From Swiss-Prot:
Associated pathology: Combined oxidative phosphorylation deficiency 55: A mitochondrial disease characterized by global developmental delay, hypotonia, short stature, and impaired intellectual development with speech disabilities in childhood. Indolent progressive external ophthalmoplegia may be present in some patients. COXPD55 transmission pattern is consistent with autosomal dominant inheritance in some families, and with autosomal recessive inheritance in others.
Assembly with partners or alone: Homodimer. Component of the mitochondrial transcription initiation complex, composed at least of TFB2M, TFAM and POLRMT. In this complex TFAM recruits POLRMT to the promoter whereas TFB2M induces structural changes in POLRMT to enable promoter opening and trapping of the DNA non-template strand. Upon metabolic stress, forms a complex composed of FOXO3, SIRT3 and mitochondrial RNA polymerase POLRMT; the complex is recruited to mtDNA in a SIRT3-dependent manner. Also forms a complex composed of FOXO3, SIRT3, TFAM and POLRMT.
Protein name listed in UniProt: DNA-directed RNA polymerase, mitochondrial
Entry keyword Nucleotidyltransferase: yes
Recorded GO MF terms: 3'-5'-RNA exonuclease activity; DNA-directed RNA polymerase activity; mitochondrial promoter sequence-specific DNA binding; RNA binding; sequence-specific DNA binding
Reported effect, residue 409 to L: In COXPD55; results in mild reduction of transcription of mitochondrial DNA in vitro; reduced DNA primase activity and
Part of the full-length chain shown: 218 to 1230 of 1230
Cellular compartments per GO CC: mitochondrial DNA-directed RNA polymerase complex; mitochondrial matrix; mitochondrial nucleoid; mitochondrion; protein-containing complex
Region (Mediates interaction with TEFM): 536-941
């Protein structure tokens, strides 16, 4: 636990070792040790940082001065202090006697020699020098040989890591030589830190105004570049004066990059700033992200680290290549580590106070230096009371009238051109050179990231491998879908088909479509990979924000698997059932009645594929239309093949539990009524929980309408399956967060006959009723929701944020605090977040087990995706893993954890006892046999 002022002082010294500003660091170390009140601020890690630096230069006397400085403050030399001293003796080649005397002092204390190379983290150049100094005492080096990495032995993950040769790992469709090329293309992209893309917006020929807007733009950009460069120079000298005065300053941090590359970066931030604006705090974080990211790239580029990674990656590709064969079947993370992974030393990101202080300076420097005639380009506006930076409205229109034919993106904001780097730790994986965190959430990030590093070694393997697997799925653009989206986009849009039209929030959706479509057009003839991330509760997301499989129906329709799989005997039926599912028609029908409807409607399926805009347009009336069209097209190709069973299908087919969370509540509470309602119990027809819930909402609605309640009165006939499903989602998963509830407002807006004046009032009323309904009808939901809410309320009232561990060993922490825990958010969020972690656990177990069976598996929100050829195998694994997850004592273990973590409080002894009382009163499960799930057709459909 280090102060904010102490964190920055150490980061200052750490930074000086990179910038070759060791006298600057030493001066600050001397000054602070000179002031009796400031000596207390000096940690042993600080003196060592200054000692390490001197050792690297070979400045013995300056290092020896720091040793004497350690003693004078009342401190003891650790292993690190002895590593610097030895590195300094190693570099300058010292006499046997002088080295032996230092070695005699070491064992006398006593510190172990063999423990120095193993425990202490030191660079390759550092270790070899420290080794050569010990070698002057002529050993007998006898350094322990490579210890084999341990495997995860947990009940749930045991079979994933077990060396029992019952494995058939999937290779990529591409050969080693092809995959090696793609890695270079990606490395080239990452080294430039920016990707340039042709704009898909129809370029009008340079008119008298377009030429003039572009001319005015060039002069401003030329003006700003010189203006910023001077502002940076002036602040660097000002902050340098502060260091010479013995005070911390962000000076060394501004010396990591070339002045011209900081200015370029600030200019491209100005350029990428949305017309609607961005929050100042987010911009500060974005500038520090871009400064660090580029710094780490430059460091690796000069350290010779790129070539080492080039060699490592090319050896790694053998496991993924179609033409190559690995000695023994292996997992990507396991193979990457086994080769001899050079742990990316430059890991160390700057602490949050350094990250924010730097970001603020860069943001306020960009604001002050940039001006334009009609004066400054950016303005500070305060909104939900959060500080935002909005650009000049004339400048935004100046960019519009310019119509720049080129779009530029940060390399890290676009898909990867080669398979991603496997996740080996919370701080390593995904992008080739750029740093990516395993957990994405900003609120309380330091607290969670620490928890993930505090982990037992093998504990995160399940989550690490699943995320590696998600990232390893090769994608490609559905060209026919893209071509049609571009015809509509390039011609005033089509809002009916979710294609944004040109110009309130018109610009945000249109530009988001413009960036996405321009990337899809750029990648149209390429294979690409989406490395994946996790939020605090374990929800998976692709790292690149602009182009992903995520978003809308149109975004989902633009993608298909790069590698295809022959349909086999059942693929075609699965394609047809999938098409029917996407229509939103046939939800209450069994699988065979859905398959029958596809045959009945086959002419419309073909007419949709053959002339989507000019025929009968049957696809347009689908719940998910673009995905229905993409499916009509695939069905058409398969039926027209030489043999439909041998047709190589690329279209992903989806399966979900309807409301995955209610399935967890039913299994956690072994609730037979709940279990039947969400397809845990086998049945010949799917069960609709929303039907039961809608009826329950109706009886309550009738009463409030029988009374004075206008909201209830106005909702008569508007308690639809779609409205209720969205409310069920909101109640099950919403933290508040108006997310799910704004989607409820959307579904009411889609109901033309509903008074659009009541939309906001009704969404709150529907949430209230659905919550009351779910408790009334299901025991599992009722008791578990109430127990989790109460436990969280008590944990928070004692002054702690709720934290747990998933059944897969992933630590979870709710970050909601007040600008001190946010009691309301901690208690309301615990049931949804706990449920999110169980969805994560289940998906991770399904992914990991499917991989062993050689399947391509992806998770897109509530849904599991595979090739039509492998649906039944995915479903089988899905059911098996749910039964396995829930067969573990989830609630009892969570209770056990929470008691051990939150009930040892000697300042709040009564509250701790009262909390232990609630925690140990774990809801008692019902009679439901969990084994039934393996026989349930509608469990996932
Ligand atoms: Cl290219
Ligand atoms: Cl490139
Ligand atoms: Cl470059
Ligand atoms: Cl293929
Ligand atoms: Cl049947």
């Amino acid at each position: 636990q280090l102060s904010g002022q102490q964190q920055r002082l150490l980061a200052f010294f750490k930074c000086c070792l990179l910038t070759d500003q060791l006298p600057l660091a030493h001066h600050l170390l001397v000054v602070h040790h000179g002031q009796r009140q400031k000596r207390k601020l000096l940690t042993l890690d600080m003196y060592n940082a200054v000692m390490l630096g001197w050792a690297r230069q070979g400045a013995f006397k300056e290092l020896v001065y720091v040793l004497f400085m350690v003693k004078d403050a009342g401190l003891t030399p650790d292993l690190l202090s002895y590593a610097a001293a030895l590195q300094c003796m190693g570099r300058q080649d010292q006499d046997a006697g002088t080295i032996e005397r230092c070695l005699e002092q070491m064992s006398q204390e006593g510190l172990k020699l063999q423990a120095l190379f193993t425990a202490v983290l030191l660079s390759e150049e550092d270790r070899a020098t420290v080794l050569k100094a010990v070698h002057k005492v002529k050993p007998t080096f006898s350094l322990p040989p490579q210890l084999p990495p341990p495997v995860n032995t947990s009940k749930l993950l045991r079979d994933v890591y077990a060396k029992d040769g019952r494995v058939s790992y999937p290779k990529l469709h591409l050969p080693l030589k092809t995959l090696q090329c793609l890695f270079e293309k990606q490395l080239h992209m990452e080294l430039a830190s920016r990707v340039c893309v042709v704009s898909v917006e129809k370029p009008t020929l340079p008119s008298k105004e377009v030429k003039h807007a572009r001319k005015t733009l060039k002069t401003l950009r030329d003006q700003w570049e010189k203006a910023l460069c001077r502002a940076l120079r002036e602040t660097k000298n000002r902050l340098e004066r502060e260091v010479y005065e013995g005070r911390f300053s962000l000076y060394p941090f501004l010396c990591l990059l070339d002045e011209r590359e900081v200015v370029r970066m600030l200019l491209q931030v100005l350029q990428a700033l949305p017309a609607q604006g961005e929050s100042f705090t987010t911009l500060a974080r974005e500038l520090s992200a871009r400064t660090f990211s580029r710094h780490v790239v430059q460091r690796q580029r000069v350290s010779g680290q790129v070539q080492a990674l080039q060699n490592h990656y090319r050896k790694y590709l053998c496991l993924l290549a179609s033409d190559a064969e690995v000695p023994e079947p292996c997992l990507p993370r396991q193979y990457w580590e086994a080769l001899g992974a050079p742990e990316a030393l430059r890991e160390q990101p700057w602490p949050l106070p350094v990250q924010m202080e730097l970001g603020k300076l860069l943001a306020e420097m960009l604001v002050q230096a940039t001006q334009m005639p009609c004066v400054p380009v950016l303005y500070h506006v305060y909104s939900q009371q959060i500080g935002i930076l909005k650009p000049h409205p004339a400048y935004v229109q100046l960019l519009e009238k310019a119509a720049e034919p080129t779009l530029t993106f940060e390399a890290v904001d676009v898909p990867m051109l080669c398979p991603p780097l496997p996740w080996t730790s919370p701080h390593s994986g995904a992008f080739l050179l750029s740093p990516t965190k395993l957990m994405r959430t900003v609120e309380g990030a330091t607290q969670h990231q620490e928890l993930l590093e505090t982990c037992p070694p093998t504990a995160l393997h399940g989550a690490l491998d699943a995320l590696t697997q998600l990232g390893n799925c090769a994608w490609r653009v559905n060209g026919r879908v893209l071509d049609l989206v571009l015809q509509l986009f390039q011609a005033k849009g089509c809002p009916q088909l979710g294609v944004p039209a040109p110009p309130r929030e018109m610009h945000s959706l249109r530009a988001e479509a413009l960036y996405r479509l321009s990337l899809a057009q750029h990648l149209r003839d390429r294979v690409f990979w989406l490395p994946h991330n996790m939020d605090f509760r374990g929800r998976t997301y692709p790292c690149p924000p602009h182009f992903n499989h995520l978003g809308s129906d149109v975004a989902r329709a633009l993608l298909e698997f790069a590698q295809g799989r022959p349909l086999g005997p059942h693929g075609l039926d699965w394609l047809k059932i999938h098409l029917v599912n996407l229509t939103g028609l046939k939800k209450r029908e069994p699988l065979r009645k859905r398959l029958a409807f596809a045959e009945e409607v086959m002419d419309d399926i073909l007419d949709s594929a053959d002339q989507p805009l000019t025929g009968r347009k049957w696809w347009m009336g689908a719940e998910e239309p673009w995905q229905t069209l993409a499916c009509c097209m695939e069905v058409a190709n398969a039926v027209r093949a030489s043999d439909p069973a041998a047709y190589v299908s690329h279209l992903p087919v989806h399966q979900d539990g309807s409301c995955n969370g209610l399935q967890h509540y039913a299994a956690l509470g072994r609730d037979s009524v709940g279990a039947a309602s969400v397809n845990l119990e086998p049945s010949d027809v799917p069960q609709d929980v929303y039907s039961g819930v809608a009826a329950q909402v109706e009886v309550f609605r009738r009463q409030d309408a029988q009374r004075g309640m206008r909201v209830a009165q106005v909702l008569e006939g508007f308690i639809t399956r779609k409205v209720v499903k969205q409310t069920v989602m909101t109640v099950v998963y919403g933290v508040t967060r108006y997310g799910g509830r704004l989607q409820i407002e959307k579904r009411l807006r889609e109901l033309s006959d509903f008074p659009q004046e009541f939309v906001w009032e009704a969404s709150h009323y529907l949430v209230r009723q659905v919550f009351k309904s779910l408790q009334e009808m299901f025991s599992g939901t009722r008791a578990i929701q109430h127990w989790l809410t109460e436990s969280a309320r008590l944990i928070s009232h004692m002054g702690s944020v709720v934290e747990w561990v998933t059944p897969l060993g992933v630590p979870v922490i709710q970050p909601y605090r007040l600008d001190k825990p946010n009691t309301r958010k901690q208690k309301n969020g615990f049931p949804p977040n706990f449920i999110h972690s169980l969805d994560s656990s289940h998906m991770m177990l399904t992914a990991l087990h499917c991989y062993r069976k050689g399947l391509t598996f992806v998770s897109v929100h509530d849904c599991y995706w595979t090739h039509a050829a492998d649906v039944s195998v995915m479903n089988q694994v899905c059911r098996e893993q749910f039964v396995r997850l829930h067969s573990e004592p989830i609630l009892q273990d969570l209770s056990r954890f929470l008691v051990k973590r939150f009930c040892s409080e000697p300042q709040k002894i009564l509250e701790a006892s009262q909390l232990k009382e609630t925690l140990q009163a774990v809801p008692k499960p019902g009679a439901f046999d969990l084994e039934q799930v393996k026989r349930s057709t509608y469990f996932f459909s």
